[PDB]
Design a protein around this ligand. Structure first.
Ligand SMILES: CCCCCCCCCCCCCCCCCC(=O)OC[C@H](COP(=O)([O-])OCC(O)COP(=O)([O-])OC[C@@H](COC(=O)CCCCCCCCCCCCCCCCC)OC(=O)CCCCCCCCCCCCCCCCC)OC(=O)CCCCCCCCCCCCCCCCC
Ligand SMILES: CCCCCCCCCCCCCCCCCC(=O)OC[C@H](COP(=O)([O-])OCC(O)COP(=O)([O-])OC[C@@H](COC(=O)CCCCCCCCCCCCCCCCC)OC(=O)CCCCCCCCCCCCCCCCC)OC(=O)CCCCCCCCCCCCCCCCC
Ligand SMILES: CCCCCCCCCCCCCCCCCC(=O)OC[C@H](COP(=O)([O-])OCC(O)COP(=O)([O-])OC[C@@H](COC(=O)CCCCCCCCCCCCCCCCC)OC(=O)CCCCCCCCCCCCCCCCC)OC(=O)CCCCCCCCCCCCCCCCC
Ligand SMILES: CCCCCCCCCCCCCCCCC[C@@H](O)O[C@H](CO[C@H](O)CCCCCCCCCCCCCCC)COP(=O)(O)OCC[N+](C)(C)C
Ligand SMILES: CCCCCCCCCCCCCCCCC[C@@H](O)O[C@H](CO[C@H](O)CCCCCCCCCCCCCCC)COP(=O)(O)OCC[N+](C)(C)C
Ligand SMILES: CCCCCCCCCCCCCCCCC[C@@H](O)O[C@H](CO[C@H](O)CCCCCCCCCCCCCCC)COP(=O)(O)OCC[N+](C)(C)C
Ligand SMILES: CCCCCCCC/C=C\CCCCCCCC(=O)OC[C@H](COP(=O)(O)OCCN)OC(=O)CCCCCCC/C=C\CCCCCCCC
Ligand SMILES: CCCCCCCC/C=C\CCCCCCCC(=O)O[C@H](COC(=O)CCCCCCC/C=C/CCCCCCCC)COP(=O)(O)OCCN
Ligand SMILES: Nc1ncnc2c1ncn2[C@@H]1O[C@H](COP(=O)(O)OP(=O)(O)O)[C@@H](O)[C@H]1O
Lengths: 320, 121, 459, 56, 42, 347, 107
């Protein structure tokens, strides 16, 4: 029995599943920070579920098999090309930004669905909130135009006006010279090309436009590189604080039912990510769209519904 | 016409008892076959919308659609035939009971009827 | 009549259950077989009709049209095989489905014992043609062309439905046999005048009558080759068939009602023939030639004499075949040049001699060279019009001379002279195109041996 | 090879089946218009010793 | 997702179809016989 | 809202409509209208936002004024004859007042101004309910008293509604306003045959309800409320666009589709009563509805509009919820012309 | 003006493909030589051999349901009878005047 109005009528109430431990948590840090390690540690000590940061092919891992699809069939963008040529003429930068924002929206919806369906909390990297820091840095560096950030703002408003902000935001603070040293030690040739101005703009955006705004509706734990090495103090701070200022205490069973209906049916989650506004960086011609869609339909288990593909090996098709 | 106010008519009967005196439609009636075709088209469209193999996704579901359409069409045909029978019966009864309004026209032969001839030139 | 209708319906499941690479072969083979079955209908009697059932009948006016309709589908498939090469299997199947549905609607239209059924199918033919024009069309004006084609026809034919329901309410029947046997004269009254107009205008707009012919050049130029073939061959003859069927109840009102339309057609044949002289597009020239021929057919139907009717039937069949062949030749040139302009590709006889022979034969047949059936219809209609009035001969002769002029102009401009130097992608003509032209042209020269088969019921 | 070419060539039988079905339906519909068989004043004929209907 | 042929729903669908067909045939036979009885044919 | 409350409110709306349909006392009909109005507002305001609130208050004002006029007509009828039964109206003035009240409830011209804005304000489900179910009660009341209506006023408002719908649909890019103007035109078609035959009215109502259900369910399936948003539907679900194009052709009255049935039968019935001019004008005006249906079809399925990059994620997901009877509604609104003589069932 | 001067991501217009290049003896029906050859064979056979010939012969030998020679024989026997009996061939009135009842004018 899939969740719906009938399930809510009969037995399904998700308020009873909350055990003070749900506490959706998001960790934010500058490129090449220790946040991924820190976020993973928090999930293991609190017993929550960890969500690796959503990349280009995050949506590929949740549909069909977990294997990613071709770049032209999924994302039509690459981060390496952005690092090599941030001012590429084919508008790759804003396409990358928009695809990553949509991936983050889908991941946030999945995490909310898991939390509302099981009660077990989740831990996230950079979410739909604070995703705008890369947009701001890219605009200030001249990589994208102003119409791109207007489109991003419209999509972000229409999409994020429908979800609950995280209970606790955890920030790991690392100086720019140290993070550049970490980039040099990393060894990735494409990551070597990141300029200091880009990182400084990123950093300026996080403190200036994100920390105070989440301080007014969430709980902030600003941490440095040294004091984030030990996760015991981080966890202790996590239990010590009590959330009483956000919208979460104001929710009830009916709002939870509405949000649970919203988080499932991902087509409704991603509805406003394809609004009919035509920017050359993301708009696609009819012929290319038709060709790419026909190629996608020719993927092995993608022509029909998940349970109706004989090529994969689905049987009893004539009676499903 | 308007038969809503017709005398001795039950308020919510689909088929009155006097309708059973008429020959029922045959099971091979072309209208019944068209209703079955409609049900088959509904099944095909249902398969296509759900993104399933259109011809051979659900045989039980298509069979159910066809059977339901045939059943309802049979009953609808019965009611339609009964209504047309009532119309004809009332027509003939009224013509019988009002001879002065429907006189017998004096039969006339063309050899003694003068019709104007219009040449085509 | 169902022995033709049922196989045409079964063409659809056969097409949709065919292999991805066997749709064209199966469709062509079964369409040709259906056409062979249609040949049996030609045997006709000098008496009333071939009354198969209460729903359908056949006549020596409907039989040649049905045979032409059944014969046209394999040719349309052959023509469409080329430009739909890079199309998905589902969309090709949809195109074949549209063609089959159009054939089925035309077949049921031409038998049509009852007039409301005739109207319903005569309007049902409008949808597949519109989809073909506005979906598989190359240019951006296909949408406007489809809008024109839809709205001209619907504005013309909406009063016809009111006229038909009024006629059935008054008379009591719309079966053509009862209508013919119980016909009564129309008194010269304003209500009768407007009933005549409502009965006539729907078929006039689809002929097309001069001044109401604007939709035809747009629809013919913007349609794909199969759409142009069917529009020029069969869809134009629906108006003539309807007028021939419906002028039985319009007497004696037609004697004076016909003058505005007779004058319009007699001057419009000259106008459109002269327009053909100054045209930069092959398709537009062929469309305007079709307009001239159909205007002369309108004159024939309005004169309403036995020779007029025989000539009109013969000219309808001959024009359908000739216009289809001309459109196919133009499409063969276009698929090589991609321009659709007369003056671009020149001197093609040097590069393609057999296609030049096809061009010459098609132009000679359009020129109405004896003893082709084109001239048979032309001469019968000319004689009937001369009996109607001796002064029509001037206009008829002017039309004949201008017709020969632009036909040979179209032949000379494209086939003769010096080849264009910078055009080097003119490949040898394929066997498919040559077979298409042969199957267009041979039936004409075979029919000229038995003209009584296309002379209609008044033979 | 039978049972394999049938799966690809089964479609060919459909148009022909339609033709024979249409002929059967034409005869069946003809069967319902016998109200004047051997009753026309022009072809009013006395039956043969082994004739039940003038035409079928 | 990952589902086996739901035998309960298939069984109910087939049973409904068969029941409807049998009931329709019985209704037609009863109508024919009762029509004949009213008009005294057989 | 709570699903229990929503189900109770929907049942209350339906029970008010049934109370109007089954009662023989004027006071009970008025009570049914009041109950329907009372339970309708939260359904329209289900998704709370300023637009829905504005639409709900406009609808409430219009329906309250109509109900007051209907009550006044009932009281005048009682004054001039001590009768409560819904029958011959017994008074010329009372009949005029009642006809205007029922036209205001139905949205017939010149009382059409509220329909497009109320439809635009509310969601697609509330629009479906408002444009389908909220026509049964006033039309049934009009049918019960069809022998009392002055033909001039009924025909005038019917022709006005047809003209207004045809002209106002040409100017719209929002799909909900297009559907509202289509509803106004179809109402005008329905009420032009009440003086002559109510069976034709009911047949037209059934056909229009089926077509409108199919169209609204298709629009809900492909969640678009603007022309450009619907222009993106081909890149994900082309079958939906093709079905929508066929349904749009049916809604334009093009034979041999199902939508040709009501206009054909109404024209034939009106011609039986020696009325010729009005059916001709009505068909000429319905050409405009067909024109904007064709424009929508051009923008939707017959051409391919540009798409966006983020549709690639939508390619990977399937609709969680499937609407039952969508296939049946499409077939019924497309392929029921051969079953036309079934209308003798007094549908 | 840092705009890319590109309106949208569009595939380039493909170049037309020659059927003769990859397959001489191409017959212009299909890109696959076997399906191409069989399409040519079925088209040529079923059109020219079957329809254009057999149907033409069938139409040539259609029985006289239009009744032309029957009319010739009827006319021949009538003219033989009338010339011999002195009757003046064809008669002006199609129907005998004895059976028409004209309406008396009395003007
Ligand atoms: C003929 C004339 C036809 C008139 C026009 C048809 C009216 C259509 C409206 C029907 C009600 C709304 C609806 O069904 O949505 C349209 C529906 C699409 O549904 P959807 O948009 O996917 O659903 C979203 C809901 O709005 C979201 O609603 P939800 O999920 O919150 O609702 C929970 C659900 C689940 O209900 C329950 O949990 C049952 C609880 C029992 C409580 C008992 C309370 C007793 C007091 O209850 C309902 O959906 C409504 C049930 C009402 C039953 C009335 C009998 O499609 C149709 O109804 C078309 C049906 C065809 C016409 C009618 C049937 C054929 C004739
Ligand atoms: C006159 C009355 C007589 C004839 C009746 C006429 C209608 C008949 C059928 C009515 C509807 C029922 C079936 C339609 C279901 C739709 C499914 C579909 O799309 O087809 C895919 C499907 C094949 O594709 P697939 O591999 O399964 O998966 C592909 C996906 O489905 C999807 O593939 P995709 O998404 O990748 O491709 C996208 C494509 C796909 O989108 C579509 O094709 C949608 C389908 C069209 C809409 C249907 C509207 C509903 C009915 C309206 C009919 C209007 C008729 C009035 C005349 C006006 C004409 C408009 O859409 C586009 O390309 C966009 C552009 C659209 C082009 C212009 C649109 C024009 C549409 C108008 C169609 C009207 C005629 C329909 C004829 C049948 C067409 C299938 O086709 C079929 O196989 C089913 C066809 C019927 C099966 C027959 C099997 C029985 C034979 C064996 C027994 C022998 C019988 C005799 C017994 C005795 C012998 C022993
Ligand atoms: C006159 C009697 C003839 C008896 C012999 C039988 C001839 C059979 C012909 C059958 C129909 C022709 C089919 C049309 C396409 C041609 C196929 C082709 O490509 O040829 C390649 C083939 C091989 O050459 P190649 O080197 O590989 O190709 C290089 C290029 O193609 C370069 O090739 P090209 O430069 O050599 O040009 C191709 C040639 C072939 O293309 C054509 O234009 C021929 C078609 C001309 C007719 C145009 C329509 C006008 C209306 C006529 C309708 C009547 C038809 C009668 C029944 C026909 C039965 C099917 O064009 C011409 O030669 C100029 C034609 C202008 C003639 C104007 C006179 C027409 C009216 C005469 C009255 C006819 C009835 C007499 C009544 C009174 C006495 C009893 O060459 C030929 O075999 C030429 C065909 C024979 C010439 C026909 C001329 C008159 C025959 C007309 C029909 C039969 C009349 C029956 C009466 C018998 C006593
Ligand atoms: C635009 C491209 C072409 C489109 C198609 C054009 C074809 C349509 C033209 C219609 C044909 C003629 C219509 C009526 C012909 C009847 C003869 C009448 O007009 O002549 C005189 C009529 O006199 C005057 O003309 C009276 C009518 C005057 C008003 C008509 C308007 C004149 C111009 C309108 C043309 C507009 C056409 C396009 C409309 C959009 C005869 O005098 P009278 O003996 O007393 O009347 C005899 C008829 N009776 C017996 C029934 C009484
Ligand atoms: C789009 C085409 C229409 C589809 C309609 C919806 C299909 C699903 C409905 C399922 C069946 C509903 C019938 C209800 C069962 C019993 C009905 C019975 O009790 O009521 C009778 C009434 O029977 C119904 O009216 C008959 C409904 C049949 C509808 C089919 C006609 C459609 C027109 C032709 C199109 C062909 C459609 C075929 C495919 C469905 C008695 O009515 P009565 O109390 O005395 O007076 C009220 C009516 N008056 C006022 C007009 C006189
Ligand atoms: C290429 C180089 C030359 C090689 C060829 C040399 C040989 C030359 C022969 C070619 C033409 C020369 C003329 C010879 C004519 C003789 C044949 C003629 O006599 O037969 C005609 C017969 O021809 C047919 O009647 C006409 C052909 C049928 C046309 C139907 C078209 C086939 C269907 C295709 C689709 C239809 C598309 C168009 C729709 C209508 C007329 O016969 P008819 O005097 O009368 O009576 C027949 C005999 N009877 C008395 C026993 C009855
Ligand atoms: C009284 C009422 C009579 C009703 C007459 C109905 C006529 C049927 C067509 C109505 C169309 C009117 C709307 C219209 O065409 O607007 C002009 C429109 C604007 O383009 P849009 O698509 O709206 O916008 C594009 C930019 N975004 O311009 C056009 O495209 C015109 C192209 C279509 C032309 C159709 C030709 C119709 C006329 C044929 C003759 C008969 C007409 C019908 C009545 C005739 C009188 C008996
Ligand atoms: C390409 C566009 C062409 C569009 C068509 C143009 C011509 C349209 C034909 C006229 C429209 C009305 C048709 C009449 C329907 C038939 C019914 C009938 O004939 O009965 C007449 C009805 O006659 C009428 O009522 C006609 C009234 C006309 C009103 C509509 C006017 C539409 C435009 C008229 C002028 C244009 C006509 C020619 C157009 C030329 C081409 C553009 C008698 O009615 P009764 O009252 O029952 O009998 C009298 C004894 N008591
Ligand atoms: N808004 C964005 N725009 C472009 N690239 C981004 C954006 N957000 C994250 N990334 C890239 O995602 C990668 C992972 O993020 P990062 O935290 O820097 O490394 P790690 O996951 O190892 O800690 C990095 O290469 C980063 O550049």
């Amino acid at each position: 029995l899939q969740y719906g109005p009938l399930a809510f009528v009969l037995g399904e109430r998700t308020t009873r599943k909350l055990t003070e431990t749900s506490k959706v948590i998001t960790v934010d840090g500058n490129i090449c920070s220790g946040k991924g390690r820190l976020a993973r540690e928090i999930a293991e000590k609190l017993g929550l579920r960890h969500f690796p940061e959503a990349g280009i092919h995050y949506a590929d891992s949740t549909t069909g098999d977990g294997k990613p699809l071709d770049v032209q069939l999924s994302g039509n963008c690459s981060l390496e090309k952005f690092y090599d040529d941030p001012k590429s003429n084919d508008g790759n930068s804003y396409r990358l930004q928009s695809w990553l924002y949509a991936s983050r929206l889908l991941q946030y919806a999945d995490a909310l669905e898991h939390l509302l369906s099981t009660g077990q909390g989740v831990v996230l990297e950079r979410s739909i909130y604070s995703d705008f820091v890369f947009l701001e840095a890219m605009y200030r560096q001249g990589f994208i135009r102003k119409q791109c950030v207007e489109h991003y703002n419209e999509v972000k408003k229409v999409t994020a006006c429908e979800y609950l902000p995280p209970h606790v935001v955890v920030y790991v603070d690392v100086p720019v010279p140290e993070i550049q040293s970490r980039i040099q030690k990393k060894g990735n040739p494409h990551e070597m090309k990141i300029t200091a101005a880009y990182l400084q703009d990123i950093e300026n955006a996080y403190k200036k436009t994100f920390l105070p705004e989440m301080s007014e509706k969430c709980e902030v734990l600003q941490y440095s590189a040294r004091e984030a090495e030990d996760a015991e103090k981080v966890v202790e701070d996590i239990e010590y604080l009590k959330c009483d200022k956000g919208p979460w205490p104001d929710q009830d069973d009916r709002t939870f039912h509405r949000l649970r209906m919203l988080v499932q049916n991902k087509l409704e989650v991603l509805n406003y990510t394809t609004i009919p506004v035509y920017l050359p960086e993301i708009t696609i011609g009819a012929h290319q769209s038709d060709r790419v869609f026909q190629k996608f339909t020719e993927l092995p288990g993608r022509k029909y519904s998940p349970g109706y593909n004989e090529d994969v090996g689905d049987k009893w098709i004539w009676l499903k | 016409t308007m038969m809503s106010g017709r005398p001795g008519r039950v308020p919510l009967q689909f088929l009155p008892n006097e309708a059973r005196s008429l020959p029922p439609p045959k099971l091979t009636d072309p209208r019944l076959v068209y209703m079955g075709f409609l049900g088959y088209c509904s099944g095909l469209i249902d398969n296509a919308i759900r993104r399933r193999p259109v011809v051979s996704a659900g045989l039980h579901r298509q069979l159910l659609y066809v059977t339901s359409f045939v059943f309802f069409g049979y009953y609808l045909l019965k009611r339609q035939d009964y209504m047309y029978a009532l119309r004809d019966h009332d027509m003939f009864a009224y013509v019988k009971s009002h001879p002065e309004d429907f006189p017998e026209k004096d039969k006339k032969t063309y050899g003694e009827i003068l019709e104007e001839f219009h040449p085509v030139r | 009549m169902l022995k033709i209708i049922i196989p045409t319906t079964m063409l659809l499941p056969m097409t949709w259950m065919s292999k991805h690479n066997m749709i064209w072969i199966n469709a062509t083979v079964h369409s040709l077989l259906i056409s062979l079955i249609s040949l049996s209908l030609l045997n006709q009697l000098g008496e009333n009709s071939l009354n198969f059932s209460l729903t359908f009948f056949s006549d020596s006016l409907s039989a040649p049209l049905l045979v032409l309709t059944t014969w046209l589908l394999p040719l349309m498939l052959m023509a469409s095989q080329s430009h739909l090469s890079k199309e998905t299997t589902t969309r090709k199947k949809l195109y074949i489905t549209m063609l089959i549905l159009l054939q089925l609607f035309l077949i049921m239209t031409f038998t049509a014992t009852e007039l409301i059924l005739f109207y319903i199918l005569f309007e049902a033919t409008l949808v597949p043609t519109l989809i073909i024009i506005t979906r598989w069309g190359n240019q951006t004006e296909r949408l406007n062309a489809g809008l024109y084609f839809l709205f001209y026809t619907l504005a013309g034919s909406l009063p016809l439905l009111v006229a038909l329901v009024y006629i059935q309410n008054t008379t009591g029947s719309l079966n053509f046999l009862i209508i013919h046997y119980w016909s009564h004269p129309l008194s010269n009254s304003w209500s009768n005048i407007f009933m005549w107009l409502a009965c006539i205008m729907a078929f006039m707009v689809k002929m097309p009558l001069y001044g109401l012919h604007l939709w035809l050049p747009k629809a013919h130029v913007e349609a794909p080759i199969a759409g142009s073939m069917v529009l020029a061959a069969v869809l134009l003859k629906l108006g003539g068939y309807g007028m021939m069927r419906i002028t039985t109840i319009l007497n004696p009102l037609t004697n004076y009602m016909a003058y505005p339309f007779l004058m319009l057609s007699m001057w419009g044949m000259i106008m459109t023939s002269s327009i053909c002289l100054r045209q930069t597009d092959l398709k537009s020239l062929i469309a305007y030639s079709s307009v001239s021929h159909m205007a002369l057919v309108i004159v024939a139907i309005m004169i309403q004499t036995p020779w007029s009717f025989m000539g009109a039937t013969a000219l309808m069949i001959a024009h359908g075949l000739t216009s289809s062949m001309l459109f196919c030749l133009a499409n063969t040139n276009y698929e090589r040049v991609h321009s659709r302009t007369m003056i671009l590709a020149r001197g093609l006889q040097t590069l393609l001699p057999l296609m030049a022979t096809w061009w010459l034969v098609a132009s000679l047949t359009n020129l109405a060279l004896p003893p082709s059936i084109n001239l048979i219809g032309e001469l019968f209609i000319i004689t009937a019009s001369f009996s109607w009035s001796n002064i029509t001969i001037i206009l008829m002769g002017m039309n004949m001379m201008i017709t020969a002029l632009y036909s040979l102009y179209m032949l000379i401009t494209t086939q003769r002279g010096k080849y264009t130097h910078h055009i080097n992608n003119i490949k040898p003509s394929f066997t498919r195109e040559n077979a298409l032209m042969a199957l267009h042209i041979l039936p004409l020269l075979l029919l000229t041996l038995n003209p009584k088969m296309i002379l209609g019921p008044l033979y | 090879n039978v049972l394999q070419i049938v799966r690809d060539h089964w479609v060919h039988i459909l148009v022909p089946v339609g033709f024979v079905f249409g002929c059967y339906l034409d005869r069946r519909s003809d069967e319902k218009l016998t109200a004047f068989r051997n009753k026309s004043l022009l072809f009013k004929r006395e039956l043969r010793p082994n004739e039940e209907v003038t035409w079928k | 997702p990952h589902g086996s042929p739901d035998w309960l729903k298939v069984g109910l669908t087939l049973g409904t179809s068969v029941f409807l067909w049998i009931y329709l045939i019985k209704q037609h036979k009863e109508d024919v016989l009762e029509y004949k009885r009213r008009n005294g044919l057989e | 809202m709570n699903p229990i409350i929503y189900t109770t409110l929907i049942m209350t709306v339906m029970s008010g409509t049934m109370l109007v349909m089954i009662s023989s006392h004027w006071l009970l009909i008025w009570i049914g209208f009041e109950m329907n109005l009372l339970a309708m507002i939260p359904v329209l305001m289900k998704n709370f936002n300023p637009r829905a609130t504005e639409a709900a208050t406009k609808y409430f004002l219009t329906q309250a004024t109509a109900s007051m006029m209907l009550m006044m007509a009932i009281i005048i009828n009682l004054l001039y004859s001590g009768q409560w039964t819904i029958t011959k109206m017994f008074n010329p003035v009372a009949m005029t007042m009642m006809t205007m009240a029922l036209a205001m409830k139905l949205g017939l011209s010149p009382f059409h101004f509220w329909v497009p804005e109320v439809t635009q304000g509310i969601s697609l489900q509330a629009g479906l309910l408002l444009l389908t179910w909220q026509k049964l009660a006033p039309l049934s009341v009009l049918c019960q008293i069809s022998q009392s209506i002055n033909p001039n006023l009924m025909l005038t408002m019917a022709m006005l509604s047809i003209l207004i719908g045809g002209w106002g649909g040409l100017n719209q890019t929002q799909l909900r306003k297009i559907m509202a103007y289509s509803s106004i035109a179809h109402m005008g078609w329905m009420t032009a045959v009440l003086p002559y035959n109510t069976t034709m009215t009911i047949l037209n109502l059934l056909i229009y309800i089926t077509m409108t259900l199919a169209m609204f369910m298709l629009l809900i399936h492909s969640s678009a409320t603007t022309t450009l948003s619907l222009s993106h539907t081909w890149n994900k679900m082309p079958v939906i666009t093709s079905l929508m194009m066929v349904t749009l052709l049916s809604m334009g009255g093009l034979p041999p589709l199902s939508g040709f049935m009501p206009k054909w039968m109404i024209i034939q019935e009106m011609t039986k009563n020696e009325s010729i001019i009005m059916p001709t004008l009505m068909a000429m005006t319905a050409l405009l509805n067909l024109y904007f249906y064709m424009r929508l079809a051009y923008s939707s399925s017959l051409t391919m509009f540009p798409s966006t990059n983020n549709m690639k994620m939508k390619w990977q997901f399937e609709h969680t919820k499937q609407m039952k009877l969508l296939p049946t509604m499409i077939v019924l609104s497309t392929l029921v012309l051969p079953m036309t003589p079934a209308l003798s069932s007094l549908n | 003006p840092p705009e890319p001067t590109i309106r949208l991501q569009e595939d380039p217009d493909p170049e037309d493909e020659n059927l003769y290049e990859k397959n001489p003896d191409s017959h212009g029906y299909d890109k696959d030589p076997i399906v191409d050859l069989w399409n040519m064979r079925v088209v040529f056979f079923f059109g020219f051999s079957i329809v254009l010939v057999l149907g033409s012969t069938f139409v040539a030998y259609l029985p006289d349901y239009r009744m032309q020679e029957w009319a010739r024989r009827e006319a021949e026997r009538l003219v033989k009878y009338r010339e011999a009996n002195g009757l003046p061939l064809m008669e002006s009135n199609c129907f005998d005047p004895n059976k028409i009842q004209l309406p008396e004018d009395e003007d």
